Design a protein around this ligand. Structure first.
Ligand SMILES: O=c1[nH]cnc2c1ncn2[C@@H]1CNC[C@@H]1OCP(=O)(O)O
Ligand SMILES: O=c1[nH]cnc2c1ncn2[C@@H]1CNC[C@@H]1OCP(=O)(O)O
Ligand SMILES: O=c1[nH]cnc2c1ncn2[C@@H]1CNC[C@@H]1OCP(=O)(O)O
Ligand SMILES: O=c1[nH]cnc2c1ncn2[C@@H]1CNC[C@@H]1OCP(=O)(O)O
Ligand SMILES: [Mg+2]
Ligand SMILES: [Mg+2]
Ligand SMILES: [Mg+2]
Ligand SMILES: [Mg+2]
Ligand SMILES: [Mg+2]
Ligand SMILES: [Mg+2]
Ligand SMILES: [Mg+2]
Ligand SMILES: [Mg+2]
Lengths: 177, 175, 181, 178
């Protein structure tokens, strides 16, 4: 065990995650199958740094169609500041936003509006985890991995002060941390 | 995924994960309470994002993530995205996908050491024969491969073939 | 001289520039003097690197109301389609913002910048350019403050450049074709 | 008056500021007039020294170019790069243009960072210098003024992103930065 005592409870084991991603990729693959030959360009996965890097690497390999990578680095104004923009113009591209968790959905709403103004051919959202407050915002999420309670969790990219990211499983963090 | 593009398979997906399992265990034993700070993996976007996610899960000690985005001018690169936190007194492990000319690695090494980390080592999945010409000490190497252009497992040709679980050799007709 | 054999003719002398900016300053000052003390926040000047840098410095010192500085570094993906190299430092939400440009011709980047800043929901958004080319006279992006209506000549000076040169010129002149060939 | 009751006193008027910059410009020009074919490269860190660099470049008789860097802070010369140079300064004559040097920790980093890019020549020009920078480890060949340790604003200098547009440099009243 990496963090003894810090993990209060195990929410999603590594077995659950990889199995869900396996069938998530198949679903995404089935939907974007008539686009690798109907258009001419591969599915574009856009990921916000950095908690969703573990998920996007497993997902891209789980999707049975060719996929490309694009990353974004953002920070909150203390509406978010762009620390690192995309490398390519996503005009006429099939873009799939890949998130790790959607709670308030504020940044997701911003990102959705920001990418759509770049005029993609298509634009959908895929997240590994969805929290109850994501009902209050509504950005249409076509691909949801898991619906979980409103408890702070870590593991599989998810963090608390840049820690617990390297966990293969997703568990609930102990409040004493 | 890419019918007719891949000529042959250099490293299968099973062999990659098996070696990464070895690397993590090796890295884990070397970096294993005194500091009170976790191991810090610094990765240059974006061909080594697949390798660092598997490696970090293969390392039996707590590891953190830091990413950098760079671009070429025109040995010297442009920082498009710097680190999020100060690596002062931190055990930094640079994670690369492949080292060939090693000019960017040389630049990155000098750049990070000026930030004064506690330690600084380099781990790469692949190493090409002309890495000897680059004066950068690499503590952890996954595979020594020929100079032939390869794709897969993060490696790309015009932003493609990154999603391949294996590392294959591209057909020169494509390149 | 600084660039002999390069500058063919002076389109706008140094004197004509300082005289027009002073006039622009008071005009902007009067229009924003109300909202200045009413909202309690200063006028926000947003400038895109790096041509309009010289212009925004002289302009802000010409406006008789307190003005703040803000910069944004951008790049082109391909030919408007714009990549952000350096985003703004603070929130634009609920701020009186005046876009400060050096010159507008195609207006592609300006159209992008306008649409982008409006998404941040400013209290007010207007554009001020030092120079305007014929193809930008009847654009969709409204510009309330135009310094000069210059012809379609490729000009350098006062921030303007060709291959990162002639920026330091105190005046604006028509560059010789022998240079940009 | 832009700010009626905020400026305690005027340290440097607009007249004596532009007079010094004119002197600096000629001094820089006569030094860099001496063959390479490449112009003098001015490097400025946002945002304070953006007013000084525009006036200085127009005060320097030799052709000068513009390069800008934007930096932030981690904790702290520990520093983050938000906007790197968009040009390679290899074998270039680089002059760092600063607004004020106090602790000089940022300047120390900027020196080490730029020198690793291997410029032809690297020098520093600052408009203002505070007592704890007079005998700093980084050499500054061009100093406009040596001012006291008092917190000043104006001519690019700021407090909470204000007072930058002032044509003069004045001392802020303790009421403001309390
Ligand atoms: O349980 C968590 N573990 C790790 N990180 C979490 C958790 N819940 C929220 N987050 C983070 C907090 N900042 C982004 C992310 O929230 C998603 P959103 O922008 O839709 O509110
Ligand atoms: O076989 C390859 N497949 C995919 N990418 C490759 C390959 N060989 C080189 N590269 C890239 C080329 N640019 C960075 C990287 O080279 C490593 P270095 O910076 O040490 O020279
Ligand atoms: O006469 C010129 N001198 C110096 N630069 C010029 C000139 N005309 C255009 N430009 C540039 C071209 N790219 C940005 C700037 O024009 C603004 P826009 O995006 O509206 O075309
Ligand atoms: O009197 C001032 N008015 C406005 N800004 C000031 C003043 N003194 C310092 N500064 C700023 C504070 N951050 C950078 C600069 O300090 C100089 P350094 O980083 O070399 O110690
Ligand atoms: Mg996320
Ligand atoms: Mg987080
Ligand atoms: Mg790499
Ligand atoms: Mg590549
Ligand atoms: Mg402009
Ligand atoms: Mg230009
Ligand atoms: Mg400064
Ligand atoms: Mg300041």
């Amino acid at each position: 065990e990496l963090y003894p005592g810090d993990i209060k409870s195990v929410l999603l084991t590594a077995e659950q995650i990889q199995a869900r991603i396996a069938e998530l990729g198949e679903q995404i693959g089935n939907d974007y199958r008539e686009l690798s030959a109907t258009t001419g360009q591969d599915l574009l996965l856009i990921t916000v740094l950095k908690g969703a890097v573990l998920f996007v690497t497993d997902l891209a390999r789980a999707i049975p169609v060719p996929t490309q990578f694009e990353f974004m680095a953002v920070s909150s104004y203390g509406v978010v500041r762009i620390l690192k923009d995309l490398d390519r113009d996503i005009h006429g591209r099939d873009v799939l936003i890949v998130e790790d968790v959607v709670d308030s959905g504020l940044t997701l709403s911003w990102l959705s509006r920001n990418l759509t103004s770049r005029n993609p051919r298509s634009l959908r959202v895929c997240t590994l985890l969805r929290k109850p407050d994501a009902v209050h915002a509504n950005v249409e999420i076509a691909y949801v991995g898991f619906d979980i309670p409103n408890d702070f969790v870590v593991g599989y990219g998810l963090d608390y002060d840049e820690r617990y990211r390297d966990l293969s499983y997703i568990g609930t963090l102990d409040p004493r941390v």
